Amino acid sequence: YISRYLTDFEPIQCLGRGGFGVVFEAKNKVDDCNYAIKRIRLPNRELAREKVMREVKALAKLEHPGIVRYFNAWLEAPPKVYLYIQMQLCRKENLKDWMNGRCTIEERERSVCLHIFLQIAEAVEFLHSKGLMHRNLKPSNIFFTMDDVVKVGDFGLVKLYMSPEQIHGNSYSHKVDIFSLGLILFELLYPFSTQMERVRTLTDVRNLKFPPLFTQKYPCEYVMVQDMLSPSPMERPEAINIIENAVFEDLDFPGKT
Ligand SMILES: CNc1ncc2cc(-c3c(C)ccc(C(=O)Nc4ccc(OC)c(C(F)(F)F)c4)c3N)ccc2n1
């Protein structure tokens, strides 16, 4: 039996795993580039297989600077069944890691944080414009390219960020992603020293109880986070309304571009 993956790529390392999948870094022999390759063992569940196959088709149609670049997808059945998905290789350190390495307010300059957030919101806006919703938006699903371009996706390298309507298992709309955005904006601007402090504070912010020093330092951002975290989905602003906010006009910081 001839395996496409072993024939065409030289494996470099395991990048991680989660759910049905394992992710490898591997170099393509012909083009000499390194890629992130997800190997999905197709589940025994036909409806889960339906979702997997449908989602690769949807991904393949997407082109946006804030969405991880897609290259290829194929099936292999050795003598159970694997779906391989080949993507652009991003940096190892995601948004969660990036925030964890910047635990002082000096390391979270306003314009830098808003610049990162804007990119996330624009990626979310793109998805919504295509009739898609992320549903699982969180810092561990937000990576950076080698050039620090933020990439939103479904990484699966294994909750506080999901909307109330999702937690209760109710029906929902694209507005669920707006809730996640609110918590992320806050988290970007507000550095944590311990994991215990992070959980406590984000849980409070979920219920619209904000640290007093945040509300005073960032009055404009405080307002937009409140609106994004509205318990009622319909009261939450659209992604396009977020990105058009004056707060994002003419962002600049030393070293930008
Ligand atoms: C550590 N470096 C690194 N770099 C790139 C990586 C790419 C992936 C990755 C792989 C290998 C395969 C698929 C994705 C992905 O984002 N999939 C995906 C599937 C469906 C979707 O909706 C149609 C989307 C969305 F972003 F459009 F929502 C995204 C994805 N993020 C995983 C780990 C990675 N790890």
From Swiss-Prot:
It is found in: Endoplasmic reticulum membrane. Ubiquitous. A high level expression is seen in secretory tissues. Induction: By endoplasmic reticulum stress. ATP binds at L15, G16, R17, G18, G19, F20, G21, V22, V23, K38. The modification Phosphotyrosine is found at Y35. Autophosphorylated at Tyr-35 following endoplasmic reticulum stress, leading to activate its activity. Dephosphorylated at Tyr-35 by PTPN1/PTP1B, leading to inactivate its enzyme activity. Changing W74S: In WRS; uncertain significance. The active site is at N136 (proton acceptor). It comes from the Eukaryota. Forms dimers with HSPA5/BIP in resting cells. Homotetramerizes in response to endoplasmic reticulum (ER) stress, leading to its activation. Interacts with HSP90B1/GRP94. Interacts with DNAJC3; inhibiting EIF2AK3/PERK activity. Interacts with ATAD3A; ATAD3A and EIF2S1/eIF-2-alpha occupy a common binding site within the cytoplasmic loop of EIF2AK3/PERK, leading to prevent EIF2AK3/PERK association with its substrate EIF2S1/eIF-2-alpha. Interacts with MFN2. Interacts with TMEM33. Interacts with PDIA6. Interacts with LACC1. The lumenal domain senses perturbations in protein folding in the ER, probably through reversible interaction with HSPA5/BIP. The insert loop specifically recongnizes and binds EIF2S1/eIF-2-alpha. Metabolic-stress sensing protein kinase that phosphorylates the alpha subunit of eukaryotic translation initiation factor 2 (EIF2S1/eIF-2-alpha) in response to various stress, such as unfolded protein response (UPR). Key effector of the integrated stress response (ISR) to unfolded proteins: EIF2AK3/PERK specifically recognizes and binds misfolded proteins, leading to its activation and EIF2S1/eIF-2-alpha phosphorylation. Belongs to the protein kinase superfamily. Ser/Thr protein kinase family. GCN2 subfamily. It is linked to Wolcott-Rallison syndrome: A rare autosomal recessive disorder, characterized by permanent neonatal or early infancy insulin-dependent diabetes and, at a later age, epiphyseal dysplasia, osteoporosis, growth retardation and other multisystem manifestations, such as hepatic and renal dysfunctions, intellectual disability and cardiovascular abnormalities. This is Eukaryotic translation initiation factor 2-alpha kinase 3. It comes from Homo sapiens (Human).
